[PDB]
């Protein structure tokens, strides 16, 4: 009667329903059928039904236990059949879902499991539009869960069935209400519910209640926990969590158990001073991250989540906006573990500069959106990293006006979880900005026209006109191809096929200086940590890509901007990085070299001869001007001070040719 | 009158001719228009005409000079127009070509350069078939070359115009005939041709001749060079080259100059003992490499060539087969520089297990193939790394029988260059094997059916029946996806959608042991160093990919086999690598762990407790058997001996579940 969790990812048989013959090919999960077409820039990539079928041997000894199929994510509608009989449907591409199959299987034989996944367009399931790909299929894990007939229920919106509600938290004491779903299919009886909080081998809490469970009972039980002088989850400084074991016992035997983290903290956002974690001001040095990657689409493996977090911590990221939808439980686990303050959001996404709408005013759309919000909150309730619930991105009032509906979602979020503030990401003026507790804007001053300086004007004017708003920046960024390089700085056309890397570097340096000076801005999030898929894009070095990443789509190459942020945000790892190394061909008679470093100064050498030292500025940048190259090959080297220095080096070619002038 | 070489890669205007309207988009070279479609597995990817146009300002001061447009590579037919007037055509996707434009331009104004590139199917330009993509477009650099009216000619098959023919080479002395093409468009006159051999600042040779040049003269001049006690290019041990400057002088002024490397060596292949470089036996530890990469197709940048060579040297590669076509001058330069013995080949490729033919018996096909061979030899003549000329890959006699034609190519190769042997890569029995000086076979014993043991039987039986043959292995390999992992070793279906990484590891370990024991095998080349594009493939973890690489297509991930070879071929870099780390889920009650290391033994730890030391075998492999894991997470660590060890580590999950049995 130990709970079992059996992965069912291997060897499914797949075909599209547009293939009428019935032949199938082997696939293995996680899987999307849009990893080739959408990623090649095909705008009308396959959106429709793909069918996955697998034989599952139901063990004779599972008779008398309860059996559940839990899906971590299927985009975007899933219809599940056991022995070809429909058992249920889930509508929504990003939340987990579960079906009990206990009474639906034949014990001691192979049973068919068939999943018919549909990512076809709909007007009743958010997201309706967006600058990303709606990759179809079973792109997260599938599990067979086996439990006692009397269990901690897995059936409440596919959540772990335990909510560790933080009611009061300070360094003196924490009070928590452990709410636990119980489900009984055995005879009427009683059981003992135990909640055990530990830190390593040390017991911190232990609470018990006897509970009466009628046959067919599905009930919520609540146990208070008190922890004196708690160790708090304090972001990257100390991402500490207790372990909580919730178990059911009968006549001296444990019959079921689940574990969840408890990371205690408290926070607030001040309109003038920014974000405070556990009573201390904390600048939120944030980036955004989509759940896709080159070649595999959104069919991410655990090492992919692991590498994305490793790259963010290397850069000194301490905040993340996991846009534009609920992401993997494992990704939120890694945010908990590494101390990253997380903004998690539902996929209520508007059109941006494109056509159509994020909101369609019909009951089916509205009720589904509420179910997606409840899923997000209940499924991910216990992650201390999550400190904001995001309710939308770039909705607009024209046509169907989502204002009243967004007020409904806000009230529902506050009722489900009074312990986190709501937030949203806006690109509009007006009423949509005054609903959520924190507000943020997506700003591209210096990329989509204008100069970075208009970001400063916007922030200052907004803060002065509306002093009660807690203002953030939910997106800012600029495109870059690592293969587009030029000696001189000039602003490219955003929508064109030329995105020189130096303009992205310049964009981030100027925008960051504006942000750094404005502590009323509670958090800022770079769009985006990685290049990502968007099939309709036709810009930069190839179609189908949003190239605003600080790192490329395959996670292989860090663009110059990554190191500018690393020098400024990760000050305890010594480093020096020469900018513009991918610009190998130089034409300008007067060369400028620039390095990012954590050192107070650096020295430049050209062809083995020192050009002398320069001091790092407040933004960890060292600059040498009017450097003279010799025609042909030149070796450029920068070094930090001391007898054991760090170095960076490049060979460039200097050419006096051109073109008219 | 210094020679100028001006890169013309930036900002061309592109459209397909199937787009009849005339609108264009900016592109930048190197460029292929098949980097999205063919790489997504679209079998009928775009094969036809793409048009590139750029305005080129012709400087008034270039009047009186000579002007050439040189193309490093356009796949596969290029028609070039200046001010919309046709100037010439090149047929062949892999060799350089050049057109003089001196008398075709208007000086002091912008002139249009239009290139109409066509990669449409043809039956008169090899390669006609092949297991790779025929990526279309201007995928290598374009240059404007500016010279004196009297110059070292760039017009001999677009070669540098100098052939440093090695006539006798030993450690006592080297005799070289410097053959130099001269071209005069100025008045009848004389000039002084100088050939200067140097090592750093030291002069080793200096020879001069006066030459008489008629107006319109295009002539070949030959100067003998003698070098006493030469330093020889000796592979990776000492890849030494002299620098040669060839210059033309008049009345005390230098008027033109080119430089080429001189890497002196001699070699032979013995049917029983293998390959000898500079009189010393040298096992050729080889891999093959295609000129493509994820995302960019064959539009490779110099850092791509640089990274490919870096990865090969890391693995201890000392030989390379640059299949299946002439590759970049820069790639052969890197082979020279790093000491890698190189097999360079023309694209005379047969069908393998697929339909159609590599040979069509018509004069147009045959004459074009001879021009592609002459291009390869003349353009790449001076690279010491190149030690074999490959004439075909997998032709077959059935239908049009290429035997007589391959004898013609062999005789032409020997006439153009008596200093290198010819070779070929075969998958057939019979006469095709008895034409080139060295012969090699493509073998997949243990992958395309059978067991690796049949490679041993083939090699031994062939060597015994035909003792005069110099036998090599031109391809051997097996597919692997880094995302297909399983606890147990079982042979997969080659053509299926399941290519577990452990089978590739096993394949290479067994095949390498067969090779290592057989010194009569002069060279072996892994197919392939990298996964590569082949649009028609439908196997492994995604369509459109040949996944036989030791490294993935984006060059990011080294598969386990890479480290098996690194431990065995690069013995002077200490290392330890735990195999099967990507296999995170373990089911077998009895676990086996395996490490590759350069150390004589290694120690295993499980959950922090030593399982004891094991000795490395002759193949640098350490193995522990019957290792007991605890249910759930286990930390596995291996370390080399000593107080400062090298380590490798992984966390795996051990699960006692399954499926019937
Ligand atoms: Cl909207
Ligand atoms: Cl053939």
Swiss-Prot record, chains A, B:
GO molecular function terms listed in the Swiss-Prot or TrEMBL record: beta-galactosidase activity
Motif range (N-K motif): 546-548
Keywords from the named record: Glycosidase, Hydrolase
Alphabetical GO biological process terms: carbohydrate metabolic process
Catalytic activity: a beta-D-glucuronoside + H2O = D-glucuronate + an alcohol
EC number: 3.2.1.31
InterPro entries, sorted: Beta-gal/glucu_dom_sf (IPR036156), DUF4982 (IPR032311), Galactose-bd-like_sf (IPR008979), GH2_Domain-Containing (IPR051913), Glyco_hydro_2 (IPR006101), Glyco_hydro_2_cat (IPR006103), Glyco_hydro_2_Ig-like (IPR006102), Glyco_hydro_2_N (IPR006104)
Chain positions recorded as D-glucuronate binding sites: 393, 442, 448, 527, 548
Catalytic residues of the enzyme: 394 (proton donor)
Purpose: Displays beta-glucuronidase activity with the artificial substrate p-nitrophenyl-beta-D-glucuronide (PNPG). Is likely capable of scavenging glucuronate from a range of chemically distinct xenobiotic and endobiotic glucuronides present in the gastrointestinal (GI) tract, to be able to utilize these diverse sources of carbon. As part of the GI microbiome, this enzyme would be able to reactivate glucuronide drug conjugates, such reactivated compounds can significantly damage the GI tract.
Domain free text: The N-K motif seems to be a discriminant that could be employed as a fingerprint to identify beta-glucuronidases from the large GH2 family of proteins.
Family, per entry: Belongs to the glycosyl hydrolase 2 family.
The name this protein goes by in its record: Beta-glucuronidase
Organism: Bacteroides fragilis (strain ATCC 25285 / DSM 2151 / CCUG 4856 / JCM 11019 / LMG 10263 / NCTC 9343 / Onslow / VPI 2553 / EN-2)
């Amino acid at each position: 009667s130990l709970r079992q969790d059996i992965l069912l990812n291997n060897n499914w048989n797949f075909r599209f329903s547009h293939q009428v013959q019935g032949d199938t090919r082997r696939v293995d999960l996680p899987h999307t059928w849009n990893a080739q077409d959408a990623l090649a820039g095909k705008i009308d990539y396959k959106r429709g039904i793909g069918n996955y079928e697998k034989a599952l041997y139901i063990r004779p000894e599972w008779k008398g236990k309860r059996l559940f199929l839990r899906f971590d994510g299927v985009n975007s509608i899933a219809d599940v059949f056991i022995n070809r009989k429909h058992i249920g449907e889930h509508r929504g591409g990003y939340g987990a879902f579960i079906f009990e199959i206990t009474d639906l299987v034949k014990y001691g034989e192979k049973n068919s499991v068939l999943v018919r996944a549909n990512n076809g367009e709909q007007l009743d399931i958010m997201p309706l539009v967006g600058d990303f790909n709606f990759y179809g299929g079973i792109y997260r894990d599938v599990h067979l869960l086996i439990t006692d007939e009397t269990c901690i229920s897995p059936l409440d919106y596919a959540s772990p069935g335990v909510y560790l509600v933080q009611e009061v938290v300070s360094p003196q004491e924490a009070k928590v209400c452990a709410k636990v779903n119980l489900s009984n299919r055995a005879a009427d009886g009683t059981a003992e519910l135990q909640v055990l909080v530990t830190d390593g081998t040390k017991v911190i809490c232990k609470e018990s209640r006897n509970v009466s469970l009628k046959q067919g009972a599905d009930i919520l039980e609540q146990l208070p926990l008190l922890i004196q002088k708690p160790r708090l989850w304090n972001g990257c400084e100390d991402p500490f969590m207790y372990q909580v074991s919730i178990s059911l016992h009968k006549d001296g035997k444990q019959i079921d158990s689940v574990t969840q983290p408890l990371g205690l903290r408290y926070y607030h956002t001040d309109p003038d001073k920014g974000f405070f974690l556990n009573g201390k001001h904390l600048p939120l040095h944030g980036v955004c991250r989509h759940q896709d990657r080159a070649e595999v689409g959104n069919a991410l493996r655990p090492q992919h989540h692991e590498e994305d977090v490793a790259l963010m911590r290397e850069m000194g990221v301490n905040a993340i906006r996991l846009a534009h939808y609920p992401q993997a439980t494992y990704m939120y686990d890694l945010m908990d573990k590494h101390g990253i303050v997380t903004w998690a959001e539902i996929p209520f996404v508007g059109p941006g500069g494109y056509a159509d709408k994020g909101f369609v005013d019909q009951a089916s759309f509205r009720e589904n959106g509420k179910q997606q919000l409840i899923e997000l909150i209940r499924q991910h309730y216990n992650h201390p990293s999550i400190c904001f619930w995001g309710l939308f991105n770039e909705l607009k009032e024209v046509g169907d006006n989502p204002v009243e509906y967004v007020k409904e979602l806000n009230a529902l979020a506050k009722q489900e979880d009074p312990t986190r503030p709501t937030t949203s990401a806006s690109n509009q003026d007006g009423n949509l900005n005054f609903i959520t507790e924190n507000i943020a804007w997506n700003r591209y001053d210096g990329w989509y026209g204008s100069t970075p300086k208009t970001l400063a004007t916007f922030l200052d004017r907004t803060h002065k006109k509306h002093p009660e708003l807690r203002i953030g920046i939910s997106e800012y960024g600029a495109g870059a191809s690592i293969y587009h390089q030029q000696d001189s700085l000039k602003q490219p056309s955003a929508s064109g096929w030329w995105h020189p890397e130096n303009w992205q570097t310049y964009y981030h340096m100027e925008n960051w200086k504006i942000i750094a000076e404005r502590p009323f801005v509670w958090g800022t999030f770079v769009w985006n940590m990685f290049d990502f898929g968007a099939a309709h894009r036709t810009e930069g070095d190839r179609p189908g890509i949003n190239d605003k990443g600080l790192v490329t789509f395959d996670r292989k190459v860090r663009k110059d901007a990554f190191y500018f942020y690393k020098a400024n945000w990760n000050k305890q790892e010594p480093m020096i990085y020469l900018a513009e190394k991918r610009c190998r061909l130089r034409y300008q008679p007067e060369q400028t070299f620039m390095a990012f470093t954590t050192a107070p100064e650096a020295e430049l050498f050209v062809n083995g001869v020192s050009c002398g030292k320069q001091k790092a500025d407040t933004y960890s940048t060292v600059v040498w001007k009017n450097v003279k190259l010799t025609s042909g090959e030149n070796i450029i080297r920068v070094t930090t001070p001391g007898k054991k220095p760090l170095t960076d080096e490049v060979t460039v070619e200097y050419k006096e040719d051109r073109h008219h002038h």
